[PDB]
Structure 1
Amino acid sequence: SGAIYVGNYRVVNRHLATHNDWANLVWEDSSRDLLVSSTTAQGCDTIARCDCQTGVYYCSSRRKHYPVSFSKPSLIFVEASEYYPARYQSHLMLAVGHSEPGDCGGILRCQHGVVGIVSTGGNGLVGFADVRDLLWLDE
């Protein structure tokens, strides 16, 4: 679990979005595993606007942060799960690092701010949904 809070927006994994997120829907994209909902309170986070390929992510299954080198956002095949059929997920970045299903939502950050959230993984890999291209999150 986990979310990004920026301005009057909450960014979460689309497969973990609550009834309240869908009732306050701003934008969602199944191909990216993202959903953005509106909030009443002002958010705590800054979004990075950069081309970094190194950063640090939070791994809830270890209660720890780990440094990572990650690929540029791209279209990557993701196996069928209980939430989606087998498909190409877009704007996805992979890295070597530990992850388990419940780690989705953990934030990846570089020196400029929030880069994205954990969305996929397996066998010593961790995949992050990029948010740096969503310029409208800051107005």
Structure 2
Amino acid sequence: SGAIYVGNYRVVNRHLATHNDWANLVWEDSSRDLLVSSTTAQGCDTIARCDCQTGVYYCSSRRKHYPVSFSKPSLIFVEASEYYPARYQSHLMLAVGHSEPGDCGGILRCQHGVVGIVSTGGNGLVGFADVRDLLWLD
């Protein structure tokens, strides 16, 4: 679990969005596993606008943060799950690091701000949905 709170927006994994997220929908994209909903309170986070390929992510299954080197946002095949058929997920960044399914929503940050959230993983890999291209979040 986890979310980004920026301005009057909440950014979550689309597959973990709540009934309230869908009732206050701003934008969603199944191919990116992202959903953005509107909030009444002002958010605590700021978004990176950069080309960093290193950063630190929060891993809830270890209660710890880990440093990572990650690939540039790309189209990656993701196997079927209970949430989606087998498909290509876009704007995904992969890295070597521990993750389990419930780690989705953990934030990846570089020195500039929030880069994205955990969205995929397996066998010593962790994948992050990029948010740096969503300029309207600002």
TM-score range (shorter-chain normalised) is: over 0.9
Residues paired across the two proteins, number: 138
Deviation at 1:108, TM superposition (A): 0.1
Inter-partner Cα distance in structure 2 for 1:100 and 1:88: 20
Deviation at 1:47, TM superposition (A): 0.1
Which 4+ residue blocks in structure 1 deviate beyond 3 angstroms?
none
Inter-partner Cα distance in structure 2 for 1:35 and 1:9: 10
For each residue in 1:83-134, what CA deviation from the matched residue of structure 2 results, as whole angstroms up to 9, or x when unmatched? 0000000000000000000000000000000000000000000000000000
Deviation at 1:18, TM superposition (A): 0.0
How well do the aligned residues superpose, as a CA RMSD in angstroms? 0.1
Work out the percentage of aligned pairs sharing the same amino acid. 100
Inter-partner Cα distance in structure 2 for 1:7 and 1:123: 36
SS of the aligned residue for 1:41 comes to: coil
Deviation at 1:78, TM superposition (A): 0.1
Inter-partner Cα distance in structure 2 for 1:75 and 1:61: 26
TM-score for the superposition, normalised by structure 2 = 1.00
TM-score for the superposition, normalised by structure 1 = 0.99
Deviation at 1:66, TM superposition (A): 0.0
Show the 5 A alignment for 1:64-75: 64-75=64-75
Inter-partner Cα distance in structure 1 for 2:132 and 2:109: 11
Where do 5+ consecutive residues of structure 1 fail to align?
none
Q: Given the alignment of the two structures, is residue 103 of structure 1 paired with residue 86 of structure 2, yes or no?
A: no
